[PDB]
Each structure stands twice: as C-alpha cells, then as structure tokens.
Symmetry: D2
Subunit: 255 residues, 4 copies
C-alpha cells in the first residue's frame, strides 16, 4: 500500500483481463489509478470495487477522447506519474491471404497509434513528475506467431517504439519500458479457444507452450508493471518478458 | 552469373541507392529483375544499363498498381521466385512532439503496408516456385534511434511481420527473411553531407559510428539478399544484420 | 518488510558492492540472508549491521566449501528458497594477445563453474521449496565489450546456462533467471576513478555511457533481484537488463 | 571449382565430418585452399583424398602445441591465412543437471571454447596481414537454451559472446569476426524414430538442416559479408519462431 503512494497512473484497456490485473496491482501499491477503457461496464464495476481507482470512458483511437482523458487526470489529481498503454486487440486467427490492408490499418489504430497518441499527450506531465511509460507489447512481437501477421506487426512496432522513445526521453529523466506477455489466461483467451473445434485441446496446447506447464495471470503482468514503475529506476528501453519461458528451447513448430 | 539464373526477382524501391545495389546484385546472379518503383528516372536509367533488369512504374501504396505489377511480371516472365521489399522512406530527424499521427500513418503506408500488399499478392506465385521473400528493415528497429519514433516503429513492425509470415508460409516451403542495414552510403547521403555546417566532421561521424570504421555499400546489402534468395535454404524468419558492428558494445 | 518474509536466501559474492546491495534488498524484504563469500571483512561487517543477514566463509570454486555452505544453511534454517549467484570477477582491460588460456580457465572457474556448483548442490532444496535461482550476468555478455574477451565469454555462458537450467527445472516449478547489469557504481569504482589521469573526465565518461546519464546503484540490482524472487512467478529464463539504456541505439 | 574465395586459405577445425565436412566442401567449391583440421585421422584423410583443393592436418585444438603447429604449417605450406572457421566442438549426450560434473564441464569448455580461443589467438597475426576473418560455429541453443544440456549450452553462449567481444577488438585491424548458430542439422552425430521425427518437426520448415547449408553460410560470411562483424547468423529453419510444445 506504499510502494507507489501518491502517484497517479493511467491504465488503458484497464477494464478487464490484463488491464484489470495491472489496475489492481497499482491500487495495491497505494497509487491513484485512472481506468481508461472504451467499455463502460467493466471499468465501472472495477471503479466501484476499488476506491483507489476512477473510471474514465475513453477510446484511444479518438484523439479528443485521449486529450480529455489527460486533462481530466491533471484536473482531478494534479499530476501524472505513469502511463500504462495496454489498450490493444488480438484478432482471431487469420491466414495471411485472408487478412486485408483495411483490417491491418484498423488494428494499427487500436494497437499502435493509440499508444503513440496518449504517450505524446501525457509526456509533458510525465516530464514534470519524472514519470514513466509502460507499454504492453507481446512475446509474439519478438518471435512471431502463426496466423497473426497484422497482430504480430503491431506488437513489434510497439516494442521498437518503446526503445526509440526511451532514447528521446532519457534526457528528461522519463523511462520508457515494455512488458511482453506470452500466454495469459483471460476471458479473451477463452473466447478465442471456444471458436476451435476442440477448445479444450487448444487450451491444453496453450498451457504446454510454456515450460512451466501453465499460462500466466493478469496479476503477474500487474506485478511486473508495478516493478517497472516503482523500482526499475535504472531500466529504460527494456522488454520485460512475462512468458513462462515459452521462447526457450526446442518445441513443436511444424506438423 | 549462375547463382540465381533463370529466376524472376521483384525489387521495390529498386531505382537507386540501396535498392539499385540489390537489383545489380541479382542481375549479376543471372536473374531477371523487375525494378518496381515510383522513381522512374532512377529505374529507367538502371533498366537501360542492365539488360537483365526491367522497370515497371509502381507505387506500392496503391493496390491496383501492385496487382498490375504482379500480373505483368507473371504474364511476361511466367514465374516469380523472389520479392525484395525495399520500398520505404527514412524521414528527417523529428523529436516526438513534432511528429503527427497523420505523418506516422503515412509512413506506415509506405514502409509497412506496401510490403504487406505486394507480399500478399505475390505469395500464390512464390508458393508455386517455392520462392522467398526478403524485407529490408533497419537496425534501428531492433535497438532504437533518437528522433525517429515513427520510423523505428515501422521497421520493428516489418521485422516482426517477417517472422509471422515465415511461420505461416513454412508449410508451403516459402522462406521469409529480412536484412537490417545500419549506416549505408548512398549518393543522396553524400549530397546531404555536403550541405552540413562541417561536412568533413559529419562524414567522419558517419564512418566512425560502427567498429568497421566505414559506411556500408549498397552492393553489400545486395550480396546479403542474393545469399538469402539463393543459398540460405534452411534460413527463415532471420534478421540479417548488415551494420558494420554498430549494435555491439562499442 | 514483508514480501519475502519467511524465506531463506543465499547471496554469493555478497560481502560488498553489487552483492551487498542484493543482500540488503533481501534483508529489507524480510528474508533470512546467508552471505556467502571469501571476503570476510565485507561479509562480517554486513552481518554485524544487518540482523537478518549471516556470514559463512565460502569459496565457490571449492566444492567442499559449497557443500558445507548448503548443508549449514539447511541445518540452521531448515530451508532454501533463493540462490543469487553474484560471485564473479571483472578483470582489468586486456587486449586479446595479452590474455592467456590459463587466465581464461581461472576466470571461468570463478564466474561460471562457481555458479554451476552452488546451483547444482542447492537444487534439491529449491525444488522442495519451489524456490528460484538468480544469476548475476552482465550486459557485455549480450553485446560484447572491448578488451574483455574472457570476461565477456564467461557472462555469455552464464546467461545461456540460465536458460538451459530454466528449461530443466521448469517441471519442478523452479524458476531460473538472470539480471544483466551495465555500469553500476561501487566504492571500488570510485576509488579507482580517483587514480585516473583525469578523474573528473573519467567519472563523466562513466555517467554518460548510458542514456539515463548516471551510473546504476547496487540497490537497483537488489530491487530487481527481490522482484525476480518474490513477484516474477511467470518469469523463467529471462535476462533482466539493469543498464540505464546502455544497449540502445544510443 | 569456383571463383568466390579463390586464392584464399581457410582453416576449418572439426573439418573431417558432419558440419565441418560440409563447410570444407563449400570452401573448396569456392576455389579456396582448405586446411582440414581434425583429431580424427580417418575422416579428414578420406576427405583430403576426395578433394584436391584440401589438405589434412591432424590436430587436437585443446593441445596448444598442435594448434601452434597447425598455424605454422599452414603459413609454411601456403604463405597466408584468410579465414579460420572454429567448428571443433562436441555435443554430449543428454544429461540432467544433477548428473553433470564440474570436471566434465571443464573438459567440454576445453573442447568447445578454449580451442576456439587458442587457434584464433595464434591465427590473428596472419589474419591481420591478410585482412582475413574468423567464423565461429556456435549453436541456437546458446541463445534460447536446451533441455538436458547445461554444460553444452553454456559453452555455446560463451562462443557467441566471445565472437562479439573479439569483433570489437579486431575491427580496428579490419578483421571481421562472426558466428553461425545452427539448429538441428542432420549428421551421423545427430543419428529413436520418434525422436528423429520430433527433431524434424522442431522446425517450421518441417525438416532438419544439412551440413552444406551451414557451409554456404560460412562461404557467404567469409567472402561477401564485408560489412558484417559480430553477427550471429542463424541456420535453424525457424526453430526459434512461434509457440511450440515446451512442457
């Protein structure tokens, strides 16, 4: 309740799954948390549950929404210490032939340009506070993934952008890092699995993709974020892997 | 003269600079090369010089241009073995505050979605030839650079996409690789350098920015591409660094 | 206070510098800490200041010292939750011609095989507690460094070995990770700087060697270690960089 | 024979079979003079009989006098040294960490790490004169790990890292130093049926690699990668890519 006391944190896509885990972690650290999500229901239930938290309806692809989010934050709490860019969408599995450019553009809006926009607008305030930026990328940005060309591209862009921005903002004492989760068990993961012919088999396959033999927890991503914000003071431009070793060793990559 | 003989290669952004180095390299391998660019002046001059090269006017951001290019390449040469996605722009230095989302979107159109569009359209024919894709990314995608957030983002996206696609295309035996150059000398570079407050100083900085103590040549990028196309048959989803050691502890 | 309470931690090379920063960080977590080192003078001082810390004289290159350490730790504290392998020496700068195989072997003995031996002997106990291993590597292992071939090689080995071990230990739920520090300030560094031809310039050079514009602190490495031990439950075989951005396009 | 590396002199350690033999052939086909360096007489002697562009010198890279002689003999016979390919190395059988020993680990560092160090050290004066290059054969498992191979993995992480440090040291002299990191390469070493299959399917390409493919990569690094130093060239069939079966 004291590790990030007196700090103000914005978590986008914060209403459920990974975002919610991050939100909870930060609230437990004693931080004030602004839950930013386009979905009313999720973030509003979460704001009721957690007094350390406040829900602001916001679509990060809409610049005015982002502009308002930032102004509201400063207006209500007078400072901004951490921006966690977690807003993002994993599409269902799609072969490259069955992707479109329009779909790819849309996914870049959702996964990359929202991050860009909030970060740009937040940065003046993060300089004043010597705050920090945490982007939620994905392991698949680094190693790839089958049937996810657009998604993988968007997350490689996020991880790369993180490094560029780290370099630009280091003169101002603003650290910029990313977390790259692997397979994290969320309702999202579950809806996707439900689309498969044998969803149970697909969930198993997902568990066994980690040497640890399980998938990760939103709380575990949340812990990593609180660490990056509150104690990783000589870390900038790093990619913190929360994957259960899924990138390690030989596996089953063909059939 | 023999290494990639009887093969058909499309090089986007092939009209000059790095792209021209790649075209030349493939021509010297014996390949038929389609220079695909909006730079006609470069492209037609290369085509006039190199009998093995032909120029087709094409903007990769324009889907119908790219459909026509692929269709013409097949109609004319009957096959497609290799696509080199080299089209792309490095903007001037820009601090993050002085970037715009619009500018960023435009750069994604050129550097990322152009690569996507052509690869997508070429892939049915690459499968038939068991061909390969070579995307020209950049070291800065991997390690960052100052004053280049959009650019770095676009190249990190191309490198990542390379890997995704390698995975998807592996069952068809189509390999998908990228080359990430560092500081490569071009006639444009040389011309810009001469406008500097101190050109000699600027040139030295550029040469000493990697352990090898010089800048790269377009031919060196080309050689790397020819290797990937012609002899790297167990390589897929790799990022081949052509940087002079720039990323090393230096 | 509370977040690694009830747990038993062995820190090798814990008597001073980076090691002492890790010890203190764990002590402040509420853990019982066994300082394992050949540096008695540092180790006994730390033990006297920190009630949660205890010193056991142990050379990790000596297998029987290590067997004794582990056995004493168990017999005294009944458990072992975390092993931090921080023992290791960075030699002064040496050109490759000026290294010897014998030197290299000795440095492997300390930096690599010491880590191996302790981890091997602890693992049966770590399995029982579902504990974890934290090896302190170095950024230079990842990107290289001039005039440090043996040292770079040993750290590359430690980081690789971390991944190997993470795989092997994963079925038992034992996590194995590494922290790769860049330039971290220590009293020894400060004392060496003072001997330089120009200490001010030397100090500046060290501070400006990473984008954050200062050197790291032992405490920061300790914080990272406590995070890995206590809260990184889905992290295994990772390399956590504590470098201030040193490896970036900088 | 070939023109790409014509007039050049190349030393390939562990060159008598498997991957080393593929590297030797690739270089002989590039028009290079190749010194096959191996501790095994039979393999390298058969290969030198087969390939006129090639010469067999019996040598154990863990023995410094053998290495000293190898280098001196190369220079005495051919007057120059352009490329050293450090491919000598051993993969032990699969071993749980508890069943490894320190002594075993030290032995493997001699075989996989210190031999490379020693030859490279002795060769470097000549490599400077020729503006030659060094190519170390590491392994993918150095980078991503492997199960039941702690010592081996450590040795290869060491090789890859050393490559980078040396690249930095030798760049002022124009000597490039790169490594190749092979994944699963089909050799008689590699060579149950179920395990072979599992090895094939560890690559998205659905097959294992061939020594010739590692050879091609070496010839490229030697002869045309002139702005490459300190790189890790992956010849792995995409094994490091994507999700797999890791439990």
């Amino acid at each position: 309740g004291t590790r990030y006391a007196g700090k103000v944190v914005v978590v986008t896509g914060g209403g459920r799954g990974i975002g919610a885990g991050i939100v909870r972690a930060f609230v437990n650290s004693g931080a004030r948390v602004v839950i930013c999500d386009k979905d009313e229901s999720g973030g509003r239930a979460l704001e009721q549950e957690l007094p350390g938290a406040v829900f602001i309806l916001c679509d990060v692809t809409q610049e005015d929404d982002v502009k308002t989010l930032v102004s509201e934050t400063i207006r209500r709490f007078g400072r901004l210490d951490c921006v966690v860019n977690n807003a993002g969408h994993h599409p269902p599995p799609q072969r490259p032939e069955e992707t479109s450019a329009q779909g790819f553009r849309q996914l870049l809006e959702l996964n990359l340009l929202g991050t860009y926009t909030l970060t740009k607008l937040a940065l003046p305030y993060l300089r004043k506070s010597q705050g920090n930026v945490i982007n939620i990328s994905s392991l698949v940005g680094a190693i790839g993934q089958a049937q996810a060309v657009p998604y993988v591209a968007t997350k490689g862009a996020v991880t790369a952008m993180t490094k560029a921005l780290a370099l630009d903002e280091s003169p101002y004492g603003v650290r910029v890092n990313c977390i790259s989760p692997g397979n994290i068990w969320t309702p999202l993961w579950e809806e996707l699995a439900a689309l498969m012919p044998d969803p149970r088999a697909s969930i198993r396959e997902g568990m066994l993709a980690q040497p640890l033999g399980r998938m990760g927890q939103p709380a575990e991503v949340g812990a990593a974020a609180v660490f990056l914000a509150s104690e990783a003071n000589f870390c900038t431009g790093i990619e913190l892997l929360v994957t259960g070793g899924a990138e390690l060793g030989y596996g089953c990559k063909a059939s």
